[PDB]
Amino acid sequence: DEAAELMQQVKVLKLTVEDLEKERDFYFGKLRNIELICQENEGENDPVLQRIVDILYATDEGFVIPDEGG
Amino acid sequence: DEAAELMQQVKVLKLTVEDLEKERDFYFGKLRNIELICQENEGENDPVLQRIVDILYATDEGFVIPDEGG
């Protein structure tokens, strides 16, 4: 019975994982599309793309977390 | 002992969740920054922003999944 409760818990946990995985990948490849426009107009016509490139490499909460791993 | 194995499993599962949560939110608010540039130049100077706006509302794998919920 003890594990049976966790059987349900790993369910909601992994489903949140799967829900997040599709979001992570979907949006991740999306920045690549915005970079696509950058690699087209950068240094050629539009400087606006450069400041959007900064976005893609700007990391929010750049705190050095101790003990990273899996 | 049975649940003890799942105790480790919910650990890696939730940690993947937390790893994904920070990615989901980080990048999510990031599109908002690219939209920020859009809401500035759109209809005023640069049409390039409009095609990046399309990005933010373009959904990959627009398959209608049956039985959605939590």
Side-chain angles (χ1 to χ4, degrees):
Chain A
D1 299 82
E2 181 177 73
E5 299 189 89
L6 283 105
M7 304 296 181
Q8 183 184 331
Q9 191 169 90
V10 295
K11 186 188 298 180
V12 305
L13 240 45
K14 67 165 56 65
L15 289 171
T16 307
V17 164
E18 294 182 56
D19 181 81
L20 264 37
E21 293 188 295
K22 62 173 181 175
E23 299 297 79
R24 195 284 306 169
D25 177 71
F26 164 57
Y27 287 122
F28 208 112
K30 227 57 179 173
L31 299 322
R32 170 63 188 139
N33 202 151
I34 115 178
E35 179 185 50
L36 214 61
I37 306 173
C38 304
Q39 296 175 329
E40 292 296 281
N41 297 334
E42 271 299 282
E44 177 61 79
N45 189 84
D46 298 281
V48 293
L49 279 310
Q50 175 58 212
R51 53 187 292 194
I52 335 168
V53 178
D54 180 75
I55 290 184
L56 310 184
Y57 294 98
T59 41
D60 296 281
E61 298 181 86
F63 170 67
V64 182
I65 299 179
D67 292 288
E68 300 183 271
Chain B
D1 300 81
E2 182 177 72
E5 299 190 89
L6 283 104
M7 304 294 182
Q8 183 183 330
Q9 191 170 90
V10 294
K11 187 188 298 181
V12 305
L13 240 45
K14 67 166 55 67
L15 289 171
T16 307
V17 163
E18 294 182 57
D19 180 80
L20 264 36
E21 292 188 296
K22 62 173 181 174
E23 298 297 80
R24 195 284 305 169
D25 177 70
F26 164 57
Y27 287 118
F28 208 112
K30 227 57 180 174
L31 298 323
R32 169 64 189 139
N33 202 151
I34 115 178
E35 179 185 49
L36 216 61
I37 305 173
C38 304
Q39 296 175 329
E40 292 296 281
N41 297 334
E42 271 299 281
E44 175 63 80
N45 190 83
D46 298 283
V48 293
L49 278 310
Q50 175 57 212
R51 52 187 292 194
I52 334 170
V53 178
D54 181 78
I55 290 185
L56 311 183
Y57 294 98
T59 41
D60 296 282
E61 298 181 85
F63 170 67
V64 182
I65 299 180
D67 291 288
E68 300 183 271

